[PDB]
Structures are given as structure tokens and as C-alpha cells.
């Protein structure tokens, strides 16, 4: 129920470049971690919730 740093990083990573991913995109991304969807879905929404410019 808690991410790995290098999970983090691999996140982070994908925000810098796509702060809206597709459906299939997040699915395809939570495959390669090992995560959850619901996880990573939830992951971008509250990573987004914290800036006003990142909406």
C-alpha cells in the first residue's frame, strides 16, 4: 500500500512529461510497477490537486 522510491521516481518522472494520462495509459503504467490501477488513477488525481497550474 506504499510505493518503493524508485516507484516514486517512475512517477514523478511520467507527471513531469503528462499530467492527463488516458485510461489505457495508466493501465499500461500500473502493469510495469506492479501497482494497482486504482493506485496510480488515484496517484495523478492528488498529484494534480496540489497546484492550481498543474489542472
Known amino acids: 500500500t506504499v510505493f518503493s522510491q524508485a516507484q516514486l521516481c517512475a512517477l514523478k518522472d511520467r507527471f513531469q512529461k503528462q499530467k492527463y494520462l488516458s485510461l489505457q495509459q ?29 489542472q
Open 26 to 54: 495508466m493501465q499500461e503504467l500500473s502493469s510495469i510497477l506492479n501497482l494497482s490501477y486504482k493506485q496510480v488513477k488515484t496517484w495523478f488525481q492528488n498529484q494534480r490537486m496540489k497546484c492550481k497550474r498543474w
